[model samples]
Target: MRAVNWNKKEDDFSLMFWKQNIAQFWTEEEIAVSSDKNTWVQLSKEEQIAYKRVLGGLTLLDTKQGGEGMPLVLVHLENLQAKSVLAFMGAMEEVHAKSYSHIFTTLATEEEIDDIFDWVDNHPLLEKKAGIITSYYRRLLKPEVTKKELYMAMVASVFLESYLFYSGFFYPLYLAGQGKLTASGEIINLIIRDESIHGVFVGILAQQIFAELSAEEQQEVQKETQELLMELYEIEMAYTEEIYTSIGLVEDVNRFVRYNANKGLMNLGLEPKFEEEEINPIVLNGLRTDTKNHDFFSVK
Candidate 1:
C-alpha cells in the first residue's frame, strides 16, 4: 500500500492529533536559555552533574526513538492518517533530542558537552535500554512483518514516549519548581507536552490493531507487554538508582517513574503495572506554564 493519501478522510482522531501537534509546534531555539546561564552556576556540583547526566541518558533514547525506532514503525503502518501523525511524532522526537543539545550548549563547556555525549555512548544502562529497543524496532523492519511484531513495536514505542523519560524529566522540573533553570525547564515542558500526545495517539493505534487479532493473539500481546514492562522497570530502577543515589532523590524519582509507568499502561488500554501515586508537587508545578499562546516562531 502507498505510504499516505491526501484524498479521503480515514481517521479523524489521527487527523485531530496531527493538527494539534502542528498547532503546538515549537523548536529548540524558541525557548531562550540566556537566563539559565547563571542559574546553572547556582546549582550544586551534584545537581549539575545529575542534570547533565540525566539529560545525556534521555538524549540517547530520543536519538534512537527518532533516528531508528519511529522510522521502523512508520514503514509498517498501512493507515495513511496514522502514518502521517506518527511521522510528525518522529520528527518531534528529533526536536526533543536537539533540545537536550540546546540545554548543553547553553550551560556547559565544550569539553563538558563532549564528556556528556561520551557518557551517553558508554553508559551501561543506556546501552542496554537502547539495545533492547533496537531489537524490537528491527523486528518491524523485517520483510514480512507480523501482527505480533507491530503490536510489540508499538508497545515499545509507548514505553519510550511515556514511561522511560520521566526520571530524566524530574530533575529539570524539580529545579524549575525551585525557581532555577526555568528556561531549560520550559523546553522540557514543551517536550513533555509533545510526548503526551504521542503516547496517547500511538497507544490508541496499538489498541485498535490488537482488537483485530484473534483472542489467543490478544492474550499473547498482553503477556508480552507485561513482560516487557517488568523488564524495562527493572532496568530503569537500576539506572535511576545509579544516577540518583548521591542526590538523595531515589525514592521520589522511583515514585515518579511508577506514576508514569501506570500512565503508560493506561494509554495502551492495559491494566496499570504499579499502584497509583501522586507525582512530586514541585515537578508538577514545573510542568505548567502560563504562556500557552507564546509565539512558536519567535526566538524571544
Candidate 2:
C-alpha cells in the first residue's frame, strides 16, 4: 500500500476521525486513579464487587477489541485512511484495557483482581453477550465471506461498542453522578468518547457495505439486524439485573441500556428497537463528554 496521504483523502470521514482521535489521545496514568482511593474505600461490599466486576467485564471487551476485533475489521477496509485509523483504534483498545487494569490495581487487592476477572468470565449472561458477538466475528473472519456476513460482523462489533457496554458503564456513571469515584469515572467518560467515535466510524463503513446489497438482501439484513439487537438486548436485561438488582439501579440501568441500544441501531442506520425511557438525570450528566477534571494536566 502507498504511504497514507492525508492531503488526498480517500474517505470523507476517515481523516476527520483520525484528527479527533489524535486530539483526544490520553493515557491512564494521567487520570490519577489513586485519587479515588478514599472514594473506593467508602463503597459498600456490594458496591465494590459491582464496581470491580463491571470493570472486569469492560476489560475483557476492550481486550477482545484491541487484540482481535479491530484487527479483524481492519482487514476489510479498502480506504487507506480508514485502515490507519482503525489500526490505531486497536492500539487504543489496548490502552483502554490497561486503564481498566490500572483501576483494579489502584483499588483492589492482588487476589481480588484475579477473582474479578474470573467472575467476569463465568458470569453466564456476560459470557452469552461476548459469545454471541465473537461467534459472528469468527464466521466472517475467513477471507471469502459475503457482504452480508461482513455487515453482520460490523453490526456485532458496533453492538458491543455502543450498546452492550452501557450496562457496565452505567454503574460508574451512576456513581459519578452522586460524586463518588469521580476520578475513575473520568476515565470511564474518556472511554465512552473513544467508543462513541469507533461505533459511528465503523457504522458509516457498515452502511456503505450495506449499500451494495440488493433490495431483498437489504430487507433480510434489516430483519436479521432487529433480531440480533433484540437477542442481545434480552441478554443485556438479564445481565443488568444480575449486576444492579441488589443495588437498586436495575430499572435505571434498563433505561440507559434501551437508550444506548437505540443509539447502536441508529449507528447502523436501523430504527430503534426499544421505546423511549427517561434516564436518571444524574447519570445523564455523567454521560457528558467534556473533561470534568480540568486538572487533566496538573496533579489532582
Candidate 3:
C-alpha cells in the first residue's frame, strides 16, 4: 500500500470512525427488562433452544472476534490513527460480550453459561481458530509485511465482520418473526444495529486496502486466500448447524447458513458465489442495507 504524504494534512478519518463508534455504543441495562422473566412461559421448547443457542453462539463469536480479531488490528494497522480506530472498536466488542452476559445471567444458571463456551475447548475448533488468527498475527510481527500477507489480513477482517457473525443472529430474528422471544430479539437487534456498523467499518477498511494493492497483488490475494475463506465459511456453517440442529432449534439450519453467507458476500460488494437456498420470506425481505450501505449503523 502507498504511504500517505507526510507533508499533507491528515484527513481525520479516525475521528470520523470514532464518532460512528461512539454513536453505536450500548449497555446491557439499556435493553434489559424485569418482565423478561415471563418469556420462559411464552417460548416453545424449540424456540427456547433457538434463543438460548443464538445467545451462546454470539457470546462465543463475540469473545473470539473481540479477543483475537481486534488485537491483530491493533498490531498490524499501518497507521497509528487507524490503530486508534480499532482500539475503540475493540472496546465496543467487549461491551457486546457484556451485553450477552447481562441477558444470559438473567436467564441461565452458572453451569449452563459455562457449557456455552465449552466449544472453545474442542480440539478441532480451537485449532482452526488458532490457524486463522496466527496467520495474521505472524505478519503483524514482521517489520515489513509483503502485500500478500497484508491483503490477506485485510480480507480476514472483512470475513470476520461480514461473513462470520450473521448465522448467530438468524435464529433470534427468525423467532422474532413469529413473535417468540420478542424481547430477546429486541436486544439482539440492538446488537445487530451496532455490529452492522462494525461490519461496515471493517468492510471500508478492507476495500481501502484492496484498492491500494497492485493488480498482481490483488490476484495473489484471490489465489492465496479466497479458497481459505470459503473453507472457513464452510466450517462455520457446519459448526452452526451441528450446534443448532442437535437441539432441534427454530429455523432451517441449512437455509439459515446459506442465506446469511450469501448476504455477507453482498455486504462486501461481491456477488454471492454460494448455492442459493430458500429462506423464510419474512426474514429475507428484512435485509435491505447491510454492510455495504452502512444502513445498520446509527449516529446516536
Candidate 4:
C-alpha cells in the first residue's frame, strides 16, 4: 500500500478536477431558495407537479451518485490521488442531492414533498433509468470485475450526471428564463456546474481505461456503451413527453436532452449521438444567468 501525498500530484486531471471543485464548492445554505416562495405560490397546479417531479427524479439519481455510484467506483479505482478526487466528488454529489431538498422544502409543504418523492417511485421510466445505472454500479461488487464493467459504470455515471438530470434541470431553468423561479434556478445552475466537471473528469478516467484495452475489446466496449445510451435516450424521450406535455415544454426539453447526450459522449471521447440542432436559447440563457451576492436573501 502506498501513502497519498498531495504535495506532488501524479495525475494532471485529478489535481485540476480537485482544484476546480474546490473553487466552486457550495452548500445549499449559500442560496436564497426561500425567495422562490412567492413564485412557487403563483405557479399553476400542473406546473408545480412538473417542477416537483423533475426535482424528485433528480434527487434519486443524485442520491445514487452520492450514496452508491461513486463509493462503489472507489473500490475498484487504482490511483491514490484519483481516489481522493472521487471522494471529494462523492461529497459534492451529496451536496447536489441536498440542495434539491432545500428547494423542495422552501417551495412546498410537507405533504407535497411526500407526493413528489412518491412520484419518483410511481413512474416506471424513473425506476428503469435508476436500474440502468445501478445495474452497472452493482457489477463492481463482484470479487473480480473487468475493466469493461468499470468503464461502463463510469459511462453510466456520466449519463446520469449529464443526460438524465437535464430533463429535471430543464423545468427550473425554463422557469428561470421567464424570471419565475430565479432563486431556485440559481441552485440548479450551481448543481449543473458541478456535474459538468463530474462528467468530464469521470469520462476522462473511463477514456483512459478504454485505451488500455485491445482493439477487439475496445470495439466491444463501444458497442455496449452505444446500446446503453440509446436505451437511456428512449426512456428520457418517453419520460419527457409524460411530464412536460402538460406544460408544452416536452419538445424543447427533448432537444436539451439530445444536446447534453452528445456532450456526454464527447466527454468519453466518442462521436456525438445526436444531430446538429441547438437547444432552445432561452434555456441556454437560463444557465448563463449570473448570481448576485444575494447577501440580502441568503442564509437566514
Maximum-lDDT candidate: 4
The lDDT for every candidate, in the order shown, is 0.87, 0.85, 0.64, 0.87
- For model 1, give the RMSD to the true fold: 2.5
TM-score preference between candidates 2 and 4, better one:
4
Clash pairs detected, candidate 2 = none
Q: C-alpha displacement of 49 in model 1, angstroms?
A: 0.6
Considering only N, C-alpha and C atoms within 3 Å, which residue pairs clash in candidate 1?
A: none
Q: Rank the candidates by TM-score, best first.
A: 4, 1, 2, 3
Winner by TM-score: 4
Q: Provide TM-scores for the models.
A: 0.95, 0.94, 0.78, 0.95
What would the per-residue lDDT of candidate 2 be over residues 1-300, giving only the tens digit for each residue? 577788997978998899998777889888777878898889899999889878998988898877778888777767889989889988998988899988888899899988998888887877788888888777756777788888888988999899988999998898887778888888898899899998998899899999998889888888888889989988988888888887888888889999999899999988887788889998987666325444355665
TM-score of 4: 0.95
- Estimate candidate 3's alpha-carbon lDDT, on a 0 to 1 scale: 0.64
lDDT of candidate 1? 0.87
Q: Write the per-residue lDDT of candidate 3 for residues 1-300, one digit (tens) a residue.
A: 656454443444656777787876777676654456675666666655556666765676677667777776666666666676777777777888887777777776888777655644453753574467456755666566665566566567666655666667777666555544455566666677767666666666666777788998877766666676677766776666655775664346556666656655565555676687787764543332222233244868
Ranking by lDDT: 4, 1, 2, 3
All candidates: CA RMSD (Å):
2.5, 2.1, 5.5, 2.5
Residue pairs whose backbone atoms clash in candidate 4: none
Model 1, clash count?
A: 0
lDDT of 4: 0.87
